[PDB]
Design a protein around this ligand. Structure first.
Ligand SMILES: *[C@@H]1O[C@H](CO)[C@@H](O)[C@H](O)[C@H]1NC(C)=O
Ligand SMILES: *[C@@H]1O[C@H](CO)[C@@H](O)[C@H](O)[C@H]1NC(C)=O
Ligand SMILES: C[C@H](CCOC(=O)N(C)C)N(C)C
Ligand SMILES: C[C@H](CCOC(=O)N(C)C)N(C)C
Ligand SMILES: C[C@H](CCOC(=O)N(C)C)N(C)C
Ligand SMILES: C[C@H](CCOC(=O)N(C)C)N(C)C
Ligand SMILES: C[C@H](CCOC(=O)N(C)C)N(C)C
Lengths: 199, 199, 199, 197, 200
């Protein structure tokens, strides 16, 4: 098998509309935000503009191939793959995807999709100009798949811009499972707490 | 039947361009706005920027399948389903859909579509800085389907952001059936009255 | 014939790229603006932001069907129909279509397309703050079809927002047939004069 | 032949990706800007926002049909035609096309494409508030086709409600060689002399 | 062969989703920014708005044809070609492509894609109003292809607008090969250092 064949097979059979559950277990999705920049804070309106890499991994066995005498990985357009329907609950703009929309697929079916995203959020900006800083919580999970279909789990300034007006003090993560009035089932989310301040 | 089969059949036969009327009864659509945020009020211009979940439900039997030994529900891209042509009469911007455009379909054909929307409206902003607050009325209904084809019915701070500069005092709903100069038939709408104030 | 059949036939045979002239007569298009809002006036720059329903009607016999024991009308995506190539000569932004892009088709081939549009225009804003008000003239006609192929004809505050900062005094319409330097034939337009003032 | 036939044939055989050179001569493209409005001048940043009709004509024989007992012209979506890859070198925003994207095609293969465009440019805005006015120069030519493949040549509607007025418009053709490439690329430079009223 | 045939073959067989590696060597991509304008500097936020031609070249032998009695080059929509997945790491807006999205392909499979791009960046704007000026560093590389699949290499005011409020003092380039926490492999990048200042 060469790359051409692998990409051909994936395109012909991938089923981007079909969540790749195994034996009625949820697809285990990992999410991890790598913050790159904080662009436009407003303590009055409690809105912040953030740029981050949304590192997202999950498994889709339907993509697997025998890697004997074959490449172990290919880059694939996400339009050819099932992708988790993650959304940020407290986003107040749609995600602006800054990078090429390609996912990396390993021969065993492991997928990594890691767009760089710019997005605005409604969160607690109070304290941003103090030494303790602000703590902005960003909430992410599947919009339409409950906990039996998708589980969501977590996996600081490492890639944060030195030229930002802000600095990151700490980043913490917490997993939740919430029942909403609209629906009987629970929906998982990750809450990423970004503790930052003006320099 | 597995998910793949169900989604395949739906894609192959769905008829997104065909309103699923039963026995010449209107498609009964329920609409309900869950307000998430109020972002940019202007009492001078009487314009407001709102984020809300537009909970929308209706029935389409053409989607139904036998759920015996099969999943009871699937998430489906709305491009593969008929969707009611709802519009907000007093919107002054097009709806920015913030979430993945997926509907949830149950085996009996019940559909739930619940995008998170950011949109600007022209409405009464007077009194927003008083204790009584402003009452902003949002009017939603089918743009091209009259009351024999589509009926529209309703179904507060529960999901409203604590970080908003505003707070919700009350939300009320009212159903209407209006005849317009352009056409002989009546068109139904729901009017959602959002009573809110600056904190 | 049911809706499914009618929409299937329309989709299979409609020819959205083909102007439905009959016997070498122009397609007679009617255009009528129902003003909904006036949002952002600037008497210095002579620019105005307007929301209006662009009521547009014409006939396309290729869409007709026998309505005996059949629905008399269907809603159809405009991407499946020929639509007149109307443009506003003095627009300075592209039309923001706020409503679902569906036209209503009657079994005899009458079409009604009535999007709600937000658009900015260059026009006479002088006097807007006086009692006489301003008169803003909006000019609309086929961009590429001359008078032998498309004719354009007209057909006040009825739907105008009570919450606008402005009010409508009067709306008048006038038909014209103009020869431009670019081309030998005449092109029809409708000029809609919107007389409005600050409240 | 009726319109439906002509449009069908064009759709089936047009080859929008294929530049219609004849006998290895360049496609001769005419370009002409009809200025409609000047919207947002900034003398400090030297940026201007303009609306103009970009009158563009060229010939594509592969579109031709026998007009005997047939319509002489049809309107065609540009997605079904080859169109010259013109760009404005000093544009600092992408062209906002305000009109329906249709070209007019004559039975002999003459094409006219005339979108109304709003676009921002980096140009000389100095003197806009004087009697001499500013002269803003707009430079347009094929982005990827050199002079042997595309030649570009120049060949009333300005809004009375603009804050500006047009004193003069002049045009000049150029053939320039760039560091990136061995061949010459043609352009038209349109000089818009305008001032605040 | 005429252009029609060449473009027809390319469209029918191009495989825009398939990186054209040769014998398991990386596709060697050259990148070079020709700066055209600097539009909106902010020394407080350290953000800059730049317009530049992103000269990008690489080889794709699957596009090659016999140029005997045939045109030596054609312009091709990039939607019909594989194109490197280059991204600017420090961009804070998506690239606004100002020009027609066509690449030039030579009969030997050499490709030149050279869009004009307007984009905002987070970079060091300090000193912009001084004689030394600011130095803004722009970092560009493949987003998803490591060094064994794509290598990235470099190739001043020449096309820079005389009407900008800024002027260019110097442009330097540096190639890097970086390993990120997310993945075991190294990813190459070019860092383009734009040294510029406000005029006056
Ligand atoms: C119209 O439909 C009806 C009922 O099926 C039929 O009686 C009539 O002949 C039809 N006319 C045409 C032209 O098909
Ligand atoms: C290249 O095309 C020429 C001209 O017809 C032909 O003579 C020659 O055999 C071809 N060469 C290759 C490598 O196929
Ligand atoms: C809160 C958010 C609401 C939107 O959900 C849907 O559209 N469903 C189909 C569940 N989910 C429950 C995470
Ligand atoms: C008021 C508003 C006007 C638009 O109507 C349509 O476009 N039709 C096709 C009816 N409707 C009737 C709800
Ligand atoms: C004013 C306007 C200019 C655009 O014309 C075209 O695009 N043609 C193809 C005629 N026409 C003459 C109505
Ligand atoms: C200056 C400008 C650069 C971009 O050129 C390309 O994309 N080529 C395909 C030539 N051209 C040469 C006019
Ligand atoms: C740092 C940056 C992050 C994005 O990576 C991807 O999306 N892969 C598919 C690896 N790359 C590795 C250059």
């Amino acid at each position: 098998l060469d790359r051409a064949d692998i990409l051909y097979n994936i395109r012909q059979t991938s089923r981007p509309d079909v969540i790749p559950t195994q034996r009625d277990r949820p697809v285990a999705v990992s999410v991890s935000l790598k913050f790159i920049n904080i662009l436009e804070v407003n303590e009055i309106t409690n809105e912040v503009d953030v740029v981050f890499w949304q590192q997202t991994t999950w498994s889709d066995r339907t993509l697997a191939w025998n890697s004997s005498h074959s490449p172990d990985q290919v880059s694939v357009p996400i339009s050819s793959l099932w992708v988790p329907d993650l959304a940020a609950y407290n986003a107040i703009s749609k995600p602006e995807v800054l990078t090429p929309q390609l996912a990396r697929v390993v021969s065993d079916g492991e997928v990594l999709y890691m767009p760089s995203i710019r997005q605005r959020f409604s969160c607690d900006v109070s304290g941003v100009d103090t030494e303790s800083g602000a703590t902005c919580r960003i909430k992410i999970g599947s919009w339409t798949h409950h906990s039996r279909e998708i589980s969501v789990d977590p996996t600081d300034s490492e890639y944060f811009s030195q030229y930002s007006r802000f600095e990151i003090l700490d980043v913490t993560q917490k997993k939740n499972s919430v029942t909403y009035s609209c629906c009987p089932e629970a929906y998982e989310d990750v809450e990423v707490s970004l503790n930052f301040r003006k320099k």
